[PDB]
Amino acid sequence: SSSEDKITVHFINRDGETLTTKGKIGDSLLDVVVQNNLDIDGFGACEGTLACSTCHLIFEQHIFEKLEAITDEENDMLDLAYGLTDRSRLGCQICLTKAMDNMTVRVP
Numbered sequence: 001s002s003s004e005d006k007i008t009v010h011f012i013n014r015d016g017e018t019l020t021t022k023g024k025i026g027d028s029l030l031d032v033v034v035q036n037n038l039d040i041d042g043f044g045a046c047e048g049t050l051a052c053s054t055c056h057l058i059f060e061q062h063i064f065e066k067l068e069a070i071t072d073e074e075n076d077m078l079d080l081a082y083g084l085t086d087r088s089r090l091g092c093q094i095c096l097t098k099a100m101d102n103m104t105v106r107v108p
């Protein structure tokens with residue numbers, strides 16, 4: 001008698017594993033991971049304020065193209081990203097969307 005929302009998010013460890021964490025259209029990257037005890041030692045640190053450059057993640061196909069755009073500043077911080085794929089960018093921002101229902105990501 002109020003409301004309820006929660007999506008599913010998957011994170012492929014840099015080792016090749018796969019973590020499962022449910023977000024919630026409106027949440028905020030990092031928080032979810034941090035909420036999962038961040039099982040990806042290396043993820044963002046600065047909270048996503050652009051002062052760590054230890055973030056950057058890979059988005060699932062058809063997902064990255066859905067994700068919102070980014071500025072030039074963040075674009076720079078998205079450079080540090082390793083093996084910048086065709087769907088890799090700096091995360092720890094924006095909020096989950098219905099287009100993220102079971103969104104899979106990878107940790108390069």
Ligand code: FES
Pocket residue numbers: 030043044045046047048049050051052053054055056077090091092
């Ligand atoms: S969390 Fe430090 S820039 Fe993304």
